[PDB]
């Protein structure tokens with residue numbers, strides 16, 4: 004991954 | 011002053027930003043926001059100038075098969091999209107506060123750099139502190155971050171003046187990210203001393219309780235709150251069902267929570283009151299205890315209220331903080347047993363526990379957004 | 395929680411309903427609609443599932459010489475049609491919200507009665523609540539209605555196992571209709587303290603204006619809006635000509651809405667512009683003032699847009715704007731170029747432009763949410 008979230 | 015508050019993510023980590031913003035305004039400061047499209051309604055019902063950016067977070071508010079902003083296949087679009095629409099919004103600004111999606115964070119930090127203004131990144135719990143991670147873990151973050159959107163970042167930094175950066179995780183989170191969580195519920199660890207904790211950022215709730223509920227509350231013995239969130243997950247419904255039972259088993263009335271998507275309830279003995287978009291701030295102060303899921307938002311509201319609480323832990327952070335403080339009980343497992351929830355309730359309803367929950371509440375802060383504001387003001391006053 | 399929203403009426407009686415439906419679906423609840431054929435494209439556009447029922451309301455939408463759904467003639471067909479198409483839509487709902495044509499509203503309330511789910515009827519102007527009606531004329535309404543469709547109603551009512559009802563006016567509107575209008579603009583009168591005023595139901599529009607409309611707005615001075623929405627009486631085309639003149643006499647450009655009247659600009663002049671469907675919320679945020687008809691919807695969209703307005707009298711909102719001191723009323727249907735120029739002069743005065751943008755923030759924007767939570771509480775209690 005590498006971007007985060009939280010969706 | 012004028013402050014830009016950006017962020018890309020769910021309602022849990024976005025609502026705090028809307029709260030800081032609304033507060034900065036109450037203090038006479040032109041605070042504007044940069045959020046995903048699905049938050050316009052919200053910024054409307056609170057009155058905060060907000061300029062949309064990127065794909066929408068909420069799947070529903072999104073086109074047919076349109077990937078979400080966290081999708082790997084659109085990091086680059088994310089970087090570009092932000093780096094593009096942010097300049098207009100960060101026009102006359104002396105400070106920037108961000109949270110959420112790293113790609114968009116790195117993008118925003120750059121406009122802050124170009125424009126020479128101060129930038130602050132905030133996290134909602136100590137777990138998410140860079141300082142609470144291993145030196146190696148931090149290396150995976152930066153590596154993966156760089157390997158994922160690094161090129162796209164440096165291409166737009168170049169395409170506008172700024173020099174190439176490396177370690178996008180350290181770059182976006184900052185050496186010392188702000189922690190907008192309450193010090194009593196989310197205390198710092200001995201490894202985070204150099205960190206600034208403002209307090210939780212919660213939006214004040216003025217809404218009164220409906221006449222029916224007021225009627226219910228008044229009409230008898232103080233009820234117990236049971237609420238497990240908006241999770242439609244089958245287990246969540248079973249836990250709720252099991253809690254209604256533990257509460258009845260204790261000869262107590264109930265104020266139960268239900269989502270907009272749930273099926274109507276067959277019937278309710280006059281001892282159960284279903285409640286929807288209610289003001290939890292005002293309601294918690296009207297009940298004997300709260301049985302709920304492992305959620306910081308509900309946990310804090312309950313703690314501020316000073317009511318004992320029963321927390322069903324996930325698969326367990328807050329659940330246990332409640333017991334550490336000796337203010338509630340962490341029953342566990344997806345679906346606890348009637349016996350399990352019944353023994354917890356018996357403890358929760360104990361006078362000594364209620365006294366402890368009361369003592370604790372006397373120690374909880376309600377000025378995070380103001381403390382945050384005072385920090386921002388001083389920032390501009392020494393860096394701009 | 396499925397909610398069925400229905401009605402038969404002009405675009406102003408529908409747009410607010412489409413807003414509650416869109417909001418409900420945004421909140422997690424579900425919504426379905428039963429509306430006249432005219433709004434299928436509009437609903438598809440907002441993404442709200444809708445079942446087309448009955449004749450089209452807009453005159454130019456039906457065959458020539460064809461009667462409208464309000465015409466006493468068709469009444470029995472209307473009643474019959476709704477009792478026939480609503481079940482497929484209402485099956486599985488937990489409540490229902492209506493507005494518009496009484497004969498259709500009663501058919502719906504009956505089918506809701508059979509299912510055991512709460513029903514609510516809404517009005518868009520306080521002066522339409524049965525409590526601002528002399529309990530004399532109220533009797534005329536019931537008598538009138540009971541005689542017009544009454545029998546047909548109880549007929550179908552019978553076909554599904556229902557006991558007959560009388561006083562169809564109090565049934566359609568119920569003993570406590572809702573007022574989906576904003577407090578600052580449409581305040582309740584002390585003769586109706588009880589009623590529930592939720593605040594206007596507005597649907598945050600995100601549609602962009604066309605490229606040409608943008609080009610216009612850019613290539614020149616800021617224009618005055620002229621439009622009469624669903625108005626389709628003959629005078630309308632004349633009233634539009636008098637307003638265009640008044641604005642041109644002032645030396646300002648204009649944006650004209652075709653509306654249900656299919657108005658055409660008087661000439662190929664380049665200082666004007668005709669639009670069809672359009673994001674009024676957006677456009678209103680880009681004009682100097684608006685000259686329009688007396689209507690709940692447009693008066694509020696302009697009022698929350700912070701612009702001065704000129705309202706053309708019939709021969710409620712006209713005055714409401716006057717008193718709030720944000721615009722001017724002028725007699726009609728076809729106003730004189732003088733009055734309009736006098737108004738366009740008062741209205742664009744530094745005094746009004748001020749109060750206009752002041753009264754804009756006193757406007758509630760949580761209208762559909764309040765109604766939503768009221769429906770949630772209903773479904774539980776009842």
Ligand SMILES: Cc1cn([C@H]2C[C@H](O)[C@@H](COP(=O)(O)OP(=O)(O)O)O2)c(=O)[nH]c1=O
Pocket residue numbers: 404405406407409622623624625651653670671672673674675688689690691692693695
């Ligand atoms: C003409 C037009 C109207 N509207 C909507 C916004 C208004 O709230 C709604 C109803 O207007 P309203 O004037 O209340 O009713 P009527 O025109 O039937 O007398 O119509 C648009 O969104 N776009 C348009 O192009």
Ligand SMILES: *[C@@H]1O[C@H](CO)[C@@H](O)[C@H](O)[C@H]1O[C@H]1C[C@](C)(N)[C@H](O)[C@H](C)O1
Pocket residue numbers: 137138139140143151
């Ligand atoms: C997300 O990354 C930050 C980066 O610095 C870490 O500090 C944090 O611990 C990490 O969050 C955890 C816990 C969480 C939020 N529940 C998720 O499971 C993520 C994937 O991991």
